[PDB]
Amino acid sequence: LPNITILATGGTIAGGGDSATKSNYTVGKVGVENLVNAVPQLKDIANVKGEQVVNIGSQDMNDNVWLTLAKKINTDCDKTDGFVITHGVDTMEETAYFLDLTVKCDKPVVMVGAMRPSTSMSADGPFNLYNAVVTAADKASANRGVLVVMNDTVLDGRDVTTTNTTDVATFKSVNYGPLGYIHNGKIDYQRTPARKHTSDTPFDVSKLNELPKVGIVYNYANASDLPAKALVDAGYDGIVSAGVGNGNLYKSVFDTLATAAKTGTAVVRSSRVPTGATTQDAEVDDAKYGFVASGTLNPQKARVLLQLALTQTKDPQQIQQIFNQY
Amino acid sequence: LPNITILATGGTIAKVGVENLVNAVPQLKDIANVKGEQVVNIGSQDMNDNVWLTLAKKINTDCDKTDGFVITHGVDTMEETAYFLDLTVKCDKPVVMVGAMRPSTSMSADGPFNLYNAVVTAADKASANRGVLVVMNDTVLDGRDVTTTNTTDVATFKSVNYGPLGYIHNGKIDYQRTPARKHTSDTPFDVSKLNELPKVGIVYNYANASDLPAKALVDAGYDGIVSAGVGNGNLYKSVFDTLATAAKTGTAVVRSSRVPTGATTQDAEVDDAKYGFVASGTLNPQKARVLLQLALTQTKDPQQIQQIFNQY
Amino acid sequence: LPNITILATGGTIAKVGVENLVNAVPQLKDIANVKGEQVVNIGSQDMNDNVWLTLAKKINTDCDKTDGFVITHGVDTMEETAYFLDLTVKCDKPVVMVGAMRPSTSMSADGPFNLYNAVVTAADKASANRGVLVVMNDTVLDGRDVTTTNTTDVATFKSVNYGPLGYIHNGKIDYQRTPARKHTSDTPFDVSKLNELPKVGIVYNYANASDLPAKALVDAGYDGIVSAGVGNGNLYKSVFDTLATAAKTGTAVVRSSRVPTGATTQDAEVDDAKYGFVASGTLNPQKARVLLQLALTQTKDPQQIQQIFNQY
Amino acid sequence: LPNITILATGGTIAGGGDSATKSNYTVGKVGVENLVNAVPQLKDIANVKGEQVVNIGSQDMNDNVWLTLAKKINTDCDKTDGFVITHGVDTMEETAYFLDLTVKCDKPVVMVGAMRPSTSMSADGPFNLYNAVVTAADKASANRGVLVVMNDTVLDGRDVTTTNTTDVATFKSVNYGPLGYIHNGKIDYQRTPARKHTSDTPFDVSKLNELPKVGIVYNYANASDLPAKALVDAGYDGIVSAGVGNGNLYKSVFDTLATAAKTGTAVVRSSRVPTGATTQDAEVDDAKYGFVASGTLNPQKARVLLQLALTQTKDPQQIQQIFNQY
Ligand SMILES: NC(=O)C[C@H](N)C(=O)O
Ligand SMILES: NC(=O)C[C@H](N)C(=O)O
Ligand SMILES: NC(=O)C[C@H](N)C(=O)O
Ligand SMILES: NC(=O)C[C@H](N)C(=O)O
């Protein structure tokens, strides 16, 4: 049976409340040892080894925990057959994409969380962790990049997002669909992401102790420019726009970001809209303003790529190329 | 034949004038006597408080002069205007908003049959007392739950939490649902003598989120801040600290979510009562902003604002 | 505390007896006084007219003896029973159906919290006069639009055309919708002295479809045949010819669709009036069968059957 | 500009009614020449050549039109750069899967239809046909198997199905998602079907003048066995069950199909449920009864594979293997 490392980071999968029934809970309060011991059947599929990297709600996920995870996976690659990462739901789609672009270990890297605390009735965490180990132990899971395994489904780290605030079925690859489905401990894979990931990206974080500063500003009717101005005034390396419709910007926000672009801030148009590409050749002249179109990457995922892009280049054309390949 | 007023505001369905739009669909004469008046001609990315105020007042004033309203509008903020009119219009005659994903000049342009189906809906008396509607892709959607789900799909508009009110086939609607939340003339919001709305801003949550956006709104003395939280409306610690402060310093704070479906609930990870925060329910950030603006024309009390978020 | 009767019928949520199921969720005592009675213990793949009849009569008879009903049932035909009870139950006290995708013995078993949420729903007086409900995956679904969308997903149950009535969080439901179609005590269907229903069969359409299934139903003298058509309820020519004949020989014919969402409409490719066929609207084949069976306890007239399909 | 053959088969894309407004229309009433001439902009992307194979509603699609299409594509492969197939919506998902298993031409084969007649306001047919030509002319569309292009999206023939009776957005790959999205005449491909198709299947129809007889029976509460009995009595080579939930059968239907199986009828459990696999190792002992599990293949698609399987073998274990690879 293969050797599988759980790296624990916290999340509701490690959460607890005073009632099995009430919705109230506090996050990252349970050790990895406890999560493992709640899944007795893990022994039938893997030799499991828990390490506790941090114990936080993923609402508090940050650059430093991203660098710690990537370096640790890359360092320990030769020491194990696979990784599972216990992690909160809230920013899982961000961590998952960061590790998909930075880890050079082509052995299965599987992220897993839970929508209901360990303490709740019909808790989802136990079977999720069982299914994440299944996936990490599966030879066919190798060379697919970093994965998220929730509700019996294997999702690629690039497309995967959380679609509902409470539903155990929340995680979906809303543009290009899942990679495979798990039934009775077995996976039928029918898809692998074409976009370049892991050992095919030039992004190497092994030496990095910080990441370029990238902010996200929201567009809506009568949008204030003040949030954009604050990011520019703090000398942010990049700004991602959560645009309306096909990545459009309220006029005030537009003007601030056009200005910033001219002083060498990187500016990526994304969209607040939950599915579909922010395209070139729409209502915005990107090449004129020195803006980048995010494609299918939602604002939080575009931040992930823009940060790593800013470690290679500050040129809008080369950042546009990066957004077309990764 | 019903009298139906088209108020035009712009969007991709049109620079093209109100009268061209109508003339492009001679079949409208089959179903209504339509008058078109131009209110603005802008991209809905540039929609604003002033246009909202113009629209509410024009529909309220002109209610008794027509049998129905169609509002031609951009797709990008259609869901914001629709909810704003939903809460401020006192006309319970049908008010139908319509747009298009493709221009008039494009292959298989959606604008024509959309406008036709939006006049069918405005001409149907069964459409009365359902609040403000969005009609797109042969579907009748309530102004509260309706949102754009895709950047380019003609089928983008969906009521993603509670579903459509009705489907249009052969110029007829089978209506099987109506919004339970209080709308139009069952709301206390009265905008007839208002010339501006409270200043409400939206800040985004993500990993390593800056508190600078939230600080810049507090520094401006914004009336309100909506959080597009992560998951069930949760806040990155820096943003949590800045909004905790905001809430006890005369800024109403609403927790919404960047997650496209489901409620931001009470009784999860956040003690709303302890911070004086309001949980948005199924209102996404831009919709929460609409209702927070209007709640602040009545009150600044976090408890009274939360009751508003529970009723409308 | 509400009195709530659980009628158990089997399914994966259970061979396990009614009283084990309850005892497995001691938290039920927090929200209701629950009595469990066993009605059958079968897989819902083996659900049948007799069980339907037992259930309608038991709920109608016992309505005045309890505050609410929960029916534990298999997932596979849950959507058929739910609609049948929706049209035949005269009790407008809450009637809630519940199942599970995973057994009691499985990791992260869904059965417990499902039963808990199904008792919350049956105990909520706001659940009254909404017709027969299905509560699965923290969602309250109307018995007419609800269907299983996935072979193994715990989130399988959806009201795919008109959306849910409400979401359950922390034992509380925000109800924002109610089915407009006539249900329970607003229907003329009365099954109290019926011991069998008319024989209705379902035939499938596809490329090169055999007419033999449809002929075997006609040869049996079936009371009715539902077509699971292709697209907008269209029929392979051989099947069209056999059902054209059926319809003028004392077999009611309903055009439904194998397509999982949308209405089978009139006024498309098929002259329903010329063939004496009925268009099912949003009723999928197995639901159309429910309503065709009950329509045939009142009438055989294709026009009167179509009016039924337009009202219920 | 590449040489693209339209093969026309009819469907609503070639349909007409007496009103642009009314929903009433008759199918397959317009010639290919007319469809081409309604899309003036086709000249900018392709040298188009129309041939009219048949003019029928796809509700009347049949084995003989399937054999005619496959042999014609395979015969003409060397004569063109790509194929588009104008076809009705109703059974497109069936034809698309049949051609995906039988055509040996690895040049783009693209199917296209329309939900609104040519005569209707905002007809979808014109832009669909433009987008199907774009896809057929795209070099990257080669070696992806047979495609369906509707509503700006490229779908693989295996997973693609129609999900709504009237909606122009109806066609979706409901299990594994689309292959790419078309914006402004350009496609970003992120997926290719893993299941074997075209020149990697052993199915060769070049000599065939008929197909094995396969029927579909529907399960529901109180299901009659009479439809199953009629198929068995007519000596059908196979029967597909549209099962309830995870491919379950009403007891009467079960008994008839178990019996048939024992006399060498092939029996495949599918599901009436619109998404998810009909799995092995559930409520049915398949190996005991000599039944086959359809996996993600809906009943009409399982008929397609079962017919072609029955041209190689009558053995339930080998048919199960075929359902695991194609
Ligand atoms: N379900 C969850 O894990 C939510 C939690 N706030 C987290 O992201 O850590
Ligand atoms: N299709 C559209 O309407 C997009 C446009 N930017 C608008 O919202 O006005
Ligand atoms: N999960 C389930 O309930 C499936 C089972 N065959 C039933 O419907 O009874
Ligand atoms: N839209 C369509 O094409 C429907 C038509 N009955 C067909 O399949 O030919």
Phi, psi of D243 (to 5 degrees): -70, 165
CA of D64 to the centre of ligand 3 (A): 39
- Decide if D34 contacts D50 (C-beta within 8 A): no
- Decide if B95 contacts B89 (C-beta within 8 A): yes
Enter the tokens of residue B140.
């009748």
* Residue in A194, A276, A279 nearest the CB of D191: A194
In this structure, the residue with its CA closest to atom 8 of ligand 2 is B74
Q: How far is B302 from chain C (nearest CA, A)?
A: 20
Best residue in D95, D165, D298 for a mutation probing chain C (most C CBs within 10 Å)? D165
Enter the tokens of residue C20.
């084990």
Q: Chain A contact for D188, CB < 8 A?
A: yes
What is the CATH architecture assignment of C199-312? 3-Layer(aba) Sandwich (3.40)
Give the residue extent of every domain in chain D: 1-212, 213-326
Q: HSE, CB side, 13 Å, CA atoms: give it for residue A109.
A: 30
Please indicate whether residue C12 is annotated as part of the active site: yes
List of chain A residues whose C-beta atoms are within 8 Å of the C-beta of residue C111:
122
CA distance A133 to A127: 10
- Decide if D261 contacts D255 (C-beta within 8 A): no
In angstroms, what CA-CA distances link C114 with C3, C117, C307?
Answer: 18, 5, 36
CB pairs under 8 A between C and D: 202
In this structure, the residue with its CA closest to atom 6 of ligand 1 is A57
Best residue in C88, C236, C269 for a mutation probing chain D (most D CBs within 10 Å)? C269
Q: Chains with ≥3 Cβ pairs under 8 A against A?
A: B, C, D
CA distance B292 to A95: 32
- Decide if A267 contacts A237 (C-beta within 8 A): no
Most ligand 3 atoms within 8 A of CB, residue of C21, C73, C76, C97 to mutate: C76
Sign of CA dihedral C267, C268, C272, C273: positive
Nearest to D92, CA basis, from D278, D265, D301, D249: D301
Q: Residues 7-26, chain A: which have Cβ within 8 Å of C?
A: 20-24
CA distance C190 to C87: 9
* Residues contacting residue B260 through CB under 8 Å, at least 6 positions apart: A163, A274, B147, B149, B160, B284
CA distance C232 to D12: 12
Phi, psi of B273 (to 5 degrees): -60, -50
How open is the CA angle C107-D281-D98, to the nearest 5 degrees?
Answer: 125
- Decide if C285 contacts C256 (C-beta within 8 A): yes
Angle between helices B212-219 and B237-247 (to 10 degrees): 20
Catalytic residue among A9, A12, A162, A278: A12
CA of B53 to the centre of ligand 2 (A): 20
- Decide if A257 contacts A241 (C-beta within 8 A): yes
Q: Across A11-117, where does the E strand assignment appear?
A: 47-56, 82-86, 109-112
Task: With CB atoms and an 8 Å threshold, state whether D166 touches B171.
Answer: no
Q: HSE, CB side, 13 Å, CA atoms: give it for residue C65.
A: 9
Q: Residues 45-64, chain B: which have Cβ within 8 Å of D?
A: none
Catalytic residue among C5, C9, C12, C187: C12
What is the CATH architecture assignment of B1-198? 3-Layer(aba) Sandwich (3.40)
Phi, psi of A39 (to 5 degrees): -120, 75
B74 in contact with ligand 2, CB cutoff 6 A: yes
C101 in contact with ligand 3, CB cutoff 6 A: yes
3-state secondary structure chain D: CCEEEEEEEECHHHCECCCCCCCCCECCCCCHHHHHHCCHHHHHCCEEEEEEEEEECHHHCCHHHHHHHHHHHHHHHHHCCEEEEECCCCCHHHHHHHHHHHCCCCCCEEEECCCCCCCCCCCCHHHHHHHHHHHHHCHHHCCCCEEEEECCEEEECCCEEECECCCCCCEEECCCCCCEEEECCEEEECCCCCCCCHHHCCCCCCCCCCCCCEEEEECCCCCCCHHHHHHHHCCCCEEEEEEECCCECCHHHHHHHHHHHHCCCEEEEEECCCECCECCCCCCCHHHHCEEECECCCHHHHHHHHHHHHCCCCCHHHHHHHHHHC
CATH of domain D213-326: 3.40.50.40
CA distance B39 to B41: 7
What is the CATH architecture assignment of D1-212? 3-Layer(aba) Sandwich (3.40)
Task: Say which residue the tokens 């008759």 belong to.
Answer: D26
DSSP state letters, chain C: --EEEEEEEESTT----HHHHHHT-GGGGGT-EEEEEEEEEE-GGG--HHHHHHHHHHHHHHGGG-SEEEEE--STTHHHHHHHHHHH----S-EEEE--SS-TTSTT-SHHHHHHHHHHHHH-GGGTTS-SEEEETTEEEETTTEEE-BSS-TT-EEETTT--SEEEETTEEEE-----S--GGGS----TT-SS---EEEEE--TT--SHHHHHHHHTT-SEEEEEEBTTTB--HHHHHHHHHHHTTT-EEEEEESSSBS-B-SSSS--HHHHTEEE-BT--HHHHHHHHHHHTTT---HHHHHHHHHH-
CA distance A29 to A154: 27
Asked if the domains at B1-198 and B199-312 fall in one CATH topology, the answer is yes
Q: Give me the residues paired with residue D180 across strands.
A: D154, D189
Q: What's CA C234's distance to the chain center, in Å?
A: 24
Look up residue A233 and give its amino acid.
Answer: D
CA distance A323 to A201: 12
CA distance A106 to A199: 7
Burial classification of residue B235, based on how many CB atoms lie within 10 Å of its CB (0-12 exposed, 13-18 middle, 19 or more buried): buried
Phi, psi of B206 (to 5 degrees): -175, 175
Q: Give me the residues paired with residue B3 across strands.
A: B33
In angstroms, what CA-CA distances link C13 with B291, C59, C121, C137?
Answer: 42, 21, 17, 13
- Decide if D198 contacts D104 (C-beta within 8 A): yes
Enter the tokens of residue B287.
């919709």
Q: Which residue of B has its CA nearest to C264?
A: B169
Q: Give me the residues paired with residue A130 across strands.
A: none
Cβ neighbours, 10 Å, residue C263: 22
The DSSP 8-state label assigned to residue A178 in this structure reads: -
DSSP state letters, chain B: --EEEEEEEESTT----HHHHHHT-GGGGGT-EEEEEEEEEE-GGG--HHHHHHHHHHHHHHGGG-SEEEEE--STTHHHHHHHHHHH----S-EEEE--SS-TTSTT-SHHHHHHHHHHHHH-GGGTTS-SEEEETTEEEETTTEEE-BSS-TT-EEETTT--SEEEETTEEEE-----S--GGGS----TT-SS---EEEEE--TT--SHHHHHHHHTT-SEEEEEEBTTTB--HHHHHHHHHHHTTT-EEEEEESSSBS-B-SSSS--HHHHTEEE-BT--HHHHHHHHHHHTTT---HHHHHHHHHH-
Q: Which residue of A has its CA nearest to D179?
A: A176
- Decide if D115 contacts D179 (C-beta within 8 A): no
In this structure, the residue with its CA closest to atom 3 of ligand 4 is D88
Q: Residues 64-83, chain D: which have Cβ within 8 Å of C?
A: 66
Which atom belonging to ligand 3 lies closest to the Cα atom of C99? Answer: 3
Phi, psi of B81 (to 5 degrees): -50, -45
Task: With CB atoms and an 8 Å threshold, state whether B46 touches A250.
Answer: yes
- Decide if B44 contacts B74 (C-beta within 8 A): yes
How open is the CA angle C99-C103-C109, to the nearest 5 degrees?
Answer: 85
Enter the tokens of residue D199.
């020149």
Catalytic residue among D12, D256, D265, D296: D12
Q: Which residue of C has its CA nearest to D231?
A: C212
